[model samples]
Target: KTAALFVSKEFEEEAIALVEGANYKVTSIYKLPKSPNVKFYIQYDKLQQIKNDEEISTLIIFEQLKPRHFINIRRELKGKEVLDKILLLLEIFALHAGSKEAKMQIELARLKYELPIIKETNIPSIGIVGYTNSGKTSLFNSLTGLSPKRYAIPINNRKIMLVDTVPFIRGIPPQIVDAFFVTLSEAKYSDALILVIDSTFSENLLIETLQSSFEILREIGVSGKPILVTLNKIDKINGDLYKKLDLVEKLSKELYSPIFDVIPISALKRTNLELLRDKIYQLATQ
Candidate 1:
């Protein structure tokens, strides 16, 4: 016999009676996020436990947040519309706050959070330090595929390795950076550093941030290291394309790293990634 069941946010007695009358067993019901990455919290551990049990067929009611949540903080969406994509990501970040993946997620979340703000910098090494939500964390994720919490991967069945690192910031407190010495050492030791600038910004603000980040590096004793500039979030900057090209050329000249390559990229879009890869590779190799 075939059984049809009703799905409802609020269960109706008639519907429940109809299912009961059909003598179908009501095993279990649960909830899941309607959006993938934005929810503040999800029952991932519970779901994992459920998955370990072979007998249960899961029915998850995915309720999207209200429209106001996505009022901002999220990019354009393609799937079914939802309430608030931003809230969803926030909830997800909240749920996994202490976990490593949460660390990585928060790093990205932090950068997105800060990029909207942070109009100036004048300190050395701003230290670029944070528990999570730092863009550098997101950048680390982009570069190494290692989660932002700074973990390691095993290769060739070799001993497990840890890629611990502290982010480089332009005006953050030194005490903060010192707390993560082992981690910050990598960026500190670099012969030169590129403070990623979101090109999708006002020219004044962009320049201010660049100088501030440089100040931080100078404090870290890497001031002698030539600063190569990277134009990040270039895909979103609205302007004549030639204007953007001109901007890069101008920044290169103004910064005096004439040979320094100014590569445009979108970390999220994974666009123009090769230019960044090649530049960093060449710098590191040299």
Candidate 2:
């Protein structure tokens, strides 16, 4: 999806199709790079407008990114997701990939780029994306039962497929880090997302955590997608009526946009996940 992509100005037509094929509903197509830059991939001037639109979740590029390139764009347009050439095609493969063998191939092929993508289904798929070291894993287990990770709940005729994601890393080789993102970035193809938040953090840490998570979502290109924030571990938080209230105030004021709802639950205690399940259903279907 590279250099001359800007100069020759041709694949814009072909590249656009692959993105749409992934079911992303490409809201806008931006193609104007002569060659990759050290910083923002193209020029700092380009994508500046999209930088302002909280609604534009992800942007696609013809070239790949060096870690510096990845981090700078992340800082500049911290809320907008940017995907490079290969990852875009990887998601495209997932959209059209047929056969359980192929599905197995993608999960297996993941991180293989260190080695080496597919699954398109009508069933609503929900991606669980939250920060590392949060209560996410427990929430996942509580919501979908134990491992094997991708569980479709038994109700509603094997309802939704919940996809898991990996965290952002540094100091690791790009292979390890970029490969780590393969899981998170692949979620971009899902119908919606469950952003797990550990609500018990001290207020400032909580705000910073929420902000950090949004930046990850942006890098993963999930900014405008349907997102339901599952505020986990409510059991020990001050039962003061304002736990949810203040958190809600914090999120409403400082967190990012396109949130469908925030449901407080204790994943460890298994409290209120049933309601969370229904909320997930509502948003994924929407």
Candidate 3:
């Protein structure tokens, strides 16, 4: 399933001609409004009209279309030329959205490159670790006071630095784990680890998550390194904090040798950041 557009009648034939030569069984062409005032939509009827053959997928845009419009269209289609153009379009959208880092991601997707397993730095490094959506990104932003692109942070007059690790996930397919071995290998070189655990999980789920993370770290050969546990989303925890702390403490003692230090923080509120920074520096220096 794919979609494309022609801005005006003049370029419609050109688009059709280009698409016709492709061995595609069906080429769904849409003429979208070039008028600034005219609103466009992904009409159900238009989408339903597309043939269901596995070999058919194409959307050709004659004139300029909204980046998102092109993006959505690209999702349904297939072709190297079309994909290159869509990647370029999305990169432009990312540029306009004020995120050099986001644009870089598009570039990575386009180029099919991943971050190196070992990124050298002069300053001591503390690896940030967490499962997906565990507030690692937020904590990294807070601690570094910079976006994701500049993953290194200069602390205490450039004497120390922090490094964000590739996130771990539960039940990652075996193939992906193999394919991204380099990405997952970055954890082994860190001076210490900052394990960000979302506080919102229930006690059982939290412990399970912690165990999974610990297992991953151990498998990567970095579990023996120092770890600082952060209970993130403190702002959203409306009740007593002791239970959460107690649960974390119990789990930490049970699962880890030389029990790790634990801290509570709200990454979004920038709460208790000084404590985290101090802890990070303390561990890294030691």
Candidate 4:
């Protein structure tokens, strides 16, 4: 028999309906007015025979009492409440078995019930990150197409989903970083990171931007992965290869990365985008 406590008959009926709706079969429901007194109706054969044992006095709560017994059916119809019922029932079974067995049962029940959620998605993820106006989204649009706004695209013909993430700012505090993490977790969890920088900016500002980008990436726990440092708006920079290579050298040292890994691309003009695409595929596969 299933036992439950209720504040009112309506509350009891609503709970029964909710539980039964989830397809649980309730053979019998022993009902009593809600009270501070704890009780239960577990069906373990040893428990049915257990009366008053002084060694395990707490086990008396599980035994049938005069007129009525008391037990709290947890107030929610969610899985947690179901788990609570299972625990209470397990406690009864354990008490009837032995004190040693009772302790083990409760510990095992808790461990089994408290498992973390398992992720089932298999799409390979690539995360784009940069400061505001650094052309991160522009590059994202260029890769995924501006007209349709596809958040995910297949790499190597259909292996991965390129995820364009929200941009971060300079000197963002811990409070703001936490909030950003909620939105930008995709970048942290990404198989590879794409760090964008505006090539049209002056060299001094570009170095500062690179510093800030690395700092943010480090703070977000993105390290020891293939990072494609992309210099955007190269069309506006107008093939200034000498300045580009210089900037690449400074960034390479700042990021502690190889020079070839740094790419110059024009998202708006679509210059060198084919190389950028190929680099993404190479990094993702590697």
Candidate 5:
């Protein structure tokens, strides 16, 4: 195994549960490279090592979405076109590089992303947006079971109308940017917004992503609806719990609308998922 990446106590146990509970024979669990980021990787020997595993086949799991890169791009340019390009690259990354569900999430994100870029005149568009991988795909999969191969998630259910969207990644070719606009248009007009965040990441990033999502929501004119914050990947949460909680508190105060709801969930274990479902239903009704 690579050098064991030590994390906080609570993080270690939750990471183990995320791996074992998903039935993934977690060969190793460790931190990412030292780029000022706190993310976990569940290394598998091969595709078959995970895909063929009987224990993990029926499970629907997702990697925690981090916002380091996304926030960087937004901070750098803040242009609609730049955002559009990054969104496309994100979809392509998920489709070609990510697992099945991650690809689906890229698609849904693209839709929401593009709509705002093109129709900069609408006010009813709310984005259920967040960091790049924060289990948004898994949440979409949970809400709408249909999965697509080329995209992150698909439009599977009528009850929950999720147009699979894409995230905004930076540093991609210009040609790829042109295609991203089309993918983003699908998620522009949502009535209620859900800001998804990886509960296990660092406090600074958590605040950055949540704030970025709010900015996106405001730019798209859907800032009026009750914003629902869903803290995901709790199954991997460790001692940084209070730190994360504090960050959320800071964000809630900054946003100042009285967060509609804050729910902890494990997209892999389906933990507290019904709470998300209830919230989604309630949001749609409102």
Candidate 6:
């Protein structure tokens, strides 16, 4: 993993989450003050302090960079790849898109990324959200049976809407973060949420996505909904299955307060889905 110098005005977790999500290792993070000055994005003293690290060859900035800011900061960091949040997000968008439009959008956004001025629910709705390609749509398809985007199925003779949402990621550039949030806002109004996670992910990223999921909900002002975790893809655990389940259970116990239960299942194989249905009914009714 290549080391990166992280800079952000927000908390370290969100910034680091984006940096790592873009596939770079965060060696150090610098928190900047609220406002910007004429000279640099970060103060001169701290900028020099951060630039001293020779091992980390990349600089990642969370703040939207002006032309002047980008030009000077590039020189300040000197010789390392200057990757800001937008470029990283574009890469993430590229990986998930699997089509040419992502690259096209990246090229488009790259041009505009330089330019300034950038950019719910019903019937006991249980919106599904998680990391990229974490089987949210698969779970919805498996649970509800072809897929209509938003499908309503009876949990307990009462039809509850299963709304699949866009995957969550941190530090999306300000231009499109609003779009991401607007797409995700459906969960905020829903009565419940099924926070899905790929059981195959390493424990480190699992923990990262767990916190990332909650922070998305937190930022969306979703405090009242009961969130139940559906740990998907257990058919491919690659380890003692129950141990993995318990690991997530313990993590939720420790950090994820809104998360109520950790139910492992394979959406592809259609295993353990009844438990999900039963739990969804139970959670919604409660």
Show model 3 residue runs off by greater than 4 Å: 1-122, 147-150
TM-score of each: 0.42, 0.53, 0.59, 0.51, 0.50, 0.57
- Candidate 3 lDDT, 1-286, residue by residue in tens: 3334433475454344233222222345556544432222344345334424443354444433344543444444334233222332333223222234434544554344222211211577677778646777678778767524226665565566566655664434332343333455566676777888888888788888889888877777665677889999888876778798888977886887655589999889999998887777667567
For model 1, how does the per-residue alpha-carbon lDDT over 62-167 read when each residue is reduced to its tens digit? Answer: 2333222233212222222222223223333332243354455545554554444333221121122222222334454565564234333322233222232333
Question: Which candidate gets the maximum lDDT versus the true structure?
Answer: 6
Scanning candidate 2 in windows of ten residues, the lowest lDDT window is: 112-121
Query: What are the candidates' C-alpha RMSDs?
Result: 16.9, 17.0, 14.7, 20.0, 13.8, 11.5
Model 5, which residues run further than 4 Å from truth?
A: 1-127, 146-158, 170-182, 219-221, 240-243, 256-258
Q: For candidate 6, what is the total of clashing residue pairs?
A: 0
Rate residue 185 of model 4 by lDDT. Answer: 48
How would you encode candidate 4's per-residue C-alpha lDDT over 113-199 as one tens digit per residue?
333211111566677777656776678878887522226776667566776565554433332233344445446667777888888
> What does candidate 5 score in Cα RMSD to the true structure?
13.8
Relative to the true structure, candidate 2 has a C-alpha RMSD (angstroms) of 17.0
Query: Using TM-score as the measure, which candidate wins?
Result: 3
Per-residue lDDT over 139-235 for candidate 5, one digit per residue giving the tens place of the 0 to 100 score: 6666555434122221123144443355443233443443443344334545555677888777777777677766655554454567778888888
Candidate 1 segments exceeding 4 Å error: 1-135, 146-186, 241-245, 252-259
TM-score of 1: 0.42
- Tell me which of candidates 1 and 2 scores higher on TM-score: 2
TM-score attained by model 4 = 0.51
Q: Weakest 10 consecutive residues, lDDT, candidate 3? A: 112-121
Ranking by TM-score: 3, 6, 2, 4, 5, 1
lDDT of 4: 0.53
